[PDB]
Amino acid sequence: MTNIRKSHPLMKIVNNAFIDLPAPSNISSWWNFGSLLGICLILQILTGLFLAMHYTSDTTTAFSSVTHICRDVNYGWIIRYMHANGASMFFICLYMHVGRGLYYGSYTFLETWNIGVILLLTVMATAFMGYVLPWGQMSFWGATVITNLLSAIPYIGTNLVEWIWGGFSVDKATLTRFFAFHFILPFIIMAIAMVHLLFLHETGSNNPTGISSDVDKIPFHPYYTIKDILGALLLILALMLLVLFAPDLLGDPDNYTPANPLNTPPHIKPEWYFLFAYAILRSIPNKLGGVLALAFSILILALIPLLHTSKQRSMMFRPLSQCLFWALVADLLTLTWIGGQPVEHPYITIGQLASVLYFLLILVLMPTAGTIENKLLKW
Amino acid sequence: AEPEHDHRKRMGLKMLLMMGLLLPLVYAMKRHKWSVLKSRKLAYRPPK
Amino acid sequence: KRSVLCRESLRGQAAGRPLVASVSLNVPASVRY
Amino acid sequence: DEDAVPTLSPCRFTGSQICHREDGLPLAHVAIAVEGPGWAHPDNVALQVANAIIGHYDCTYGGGAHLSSPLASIAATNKLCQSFQTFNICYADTGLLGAHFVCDHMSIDDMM
Amino acid sequence: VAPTLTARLYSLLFRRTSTFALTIVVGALFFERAFDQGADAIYEHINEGKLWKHIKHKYENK
Amino acid sequence: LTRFLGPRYRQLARNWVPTASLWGAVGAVGLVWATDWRLILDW
Amino acid sequence: AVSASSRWLEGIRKWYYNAAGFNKLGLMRDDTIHENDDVKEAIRRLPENLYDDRVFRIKRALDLSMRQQILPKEQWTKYEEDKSYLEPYLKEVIRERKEREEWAKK
């Protein structure tokens, strides 16, 4: 070759994973969440760096600082609310991503699914720490209750919770730590995302039908670059629709109250992206049992590849699993509802059944349904 | 509470107007780019 | 390869001065008789 | 005259592709074209002069790497293709313009 | 015959990408101003007299 | 340096100026929105 | 002792196959298979005819998926025509690998 810009620079060749790569033809709109997921990481990042251009990480100021970012600083208001709302998007998008590989057998790519899982739980920590930075009532108490949930571990726990906090409570110590970790996790995450993409470039993307598309492969550049741009268009639409017309709507917490350590919102709860886990945690009487169960809710994901029973990696051609699949999402929705509910009889009893129904759907129902379907097809 | 929001609402109106023109435009571009895939005909013709 | 099924192919070699003359050129290249 | 009359009507120009994949075959033939002038047109000699430049090339050209038309040189140099020719097909109301290259399965894009 | 509006537009401005981008630069300018103007006006209309712009009179120069 | 200079090259340069010329105009437009010169606004 | 049950079992099977997208898609149950290592080797063992056919049907399929259109009622895959053409091939491959595994015990 001569003057083929792409392969000339070795570096520029590496970028032809966007332009020349084999892309399946058929391909639901669902896939656009991978790309969108990465737009969200970049958005969050630029926003973060501008917010962290005018934020301070101290008990005294933090609150003020954020408050100053939203009032005297020029266009810091939208930057901050874009930031907050963004993260909602980032999660909404992540849970579409996981649903699509729960449905279509994308998780077949073991390697790629274990990086995903790492990705998902990294992004979870970042969102957990970033919400406390502001240092508002909700934040303050939420980080106490969660962190302390770690003190359920029998031998260490207790010592360990105090290490993490850098003291006996959540004072300055802890709030600067979160600022530092929040800032450096998304930069570590970016390398994982690229390691994720790496593996996934070795086998290409699955489809609705669940079958190899090597017989029908499209250039990513011509087609997918427009689709992606279009998906951004809608993505930003939702971000701005949220951030411009209903700033607070999706940010349940109304606690714009500076944290007072004796004071408590009797209604303490993580934002929407964590509710599922929360509800599953309350269903167990015992503290430790809850924490394990909390972990398993999320960590349960890596086990699905082993759980797969069918011969059709595609759910598309399998009724019964489509039916339980959907239920689990609606069970998931049910559990998110419990998260903002008084922890009283009515919700208790519901949540408990929901929590068992979630684990059933993942651990026992679906697996069986997989077999059945195989035996009906005579497979 | 939200001094910026009152100003922000006007931007939202502009954004809404901008989004519709943009949302519609993006779809048209996508169709033109994705038009070729839909248009193509696939058939099998073995001598058999 | 071109199929030689019918009555059409007669190819056999025999010219006046030249016989089996092979020519190689950058612009072109071939085999005659 | 009527029979002639049916003749000479314009034939609608369409830019589409027809892709008939047979991995069984050893090489790949690609004919890429942009519609052109009828038989008579000032633009129609100037085109030729254009294709003179790109030229045409085969496994057996004696110049290979030193041939003055880039597609040829690149081809010659990088084992890009087996043979390639530019054409100008001239019809009264229609014209096919482009080139045509035969090239291994893995080199279709580079020669394009 | 004449070129459809688009064909006219095309051959004047979109054959050469140099002209195309020139266009876009120009367009982006002109557009911003009319959008704003029109978009602003729309918004102010919906809150007549609610905004300082409307209310400055009261305590201004006597 | 010396190798790049040539008698033959001029058509490309002429062509480049228009595309380059067109490109140059875009920056002025791009800069101007950010710059917000009162005079530029006046224009 | 399956007489009523067999017929009943058969009846259940037609509904699932008809119900499944595969019947609607026009790709036979065998083309819906998760392509894994054993399926992969069975695939490779297919005849030109059998094999090229799978390529077209998946070609036509992924084309419909892409356009979200279903094939005409007249042209669908009918359960009664269950070409389990992969099955034969697929069986052995597994058969051979089971053996290999077993031979490796001790």
Ligand code: HEM
């Ligand atoms: C995708 C990963 C990220 C997620 C999920 C995320 C999420 C969040 C959330 C949920 C908050 C709380 C805001 C509120 O409700 O008031 C926040 C605040 C903050 N984040 Fe991020 N963020 C991410 C990346 C970053 C990065 C890369 C930076 C800096 C480079 C950053 C800097 C900040 C700062 C300085 C604040 C505090 C000011 C404020 O409250 O907005 N974040 N982040």
Ligand code: HEM
């Ligand atoms: C920071 C978050 C993430 C980013 C930035 C990201 C990025 C991407 C991108 C760009 C692609 C290719 C297009 C697509 O298939 O949508 C993709 C595919 C994939 N991702 Fe994600 N990813 C993220 C999180 C995850 C998570 C949480 C999981 C699952 C645990 C995961 C698993 C996968 C899988 C299995 C595929 C391949 C599916 C297929 O195309 O057949 N990813 N990822």
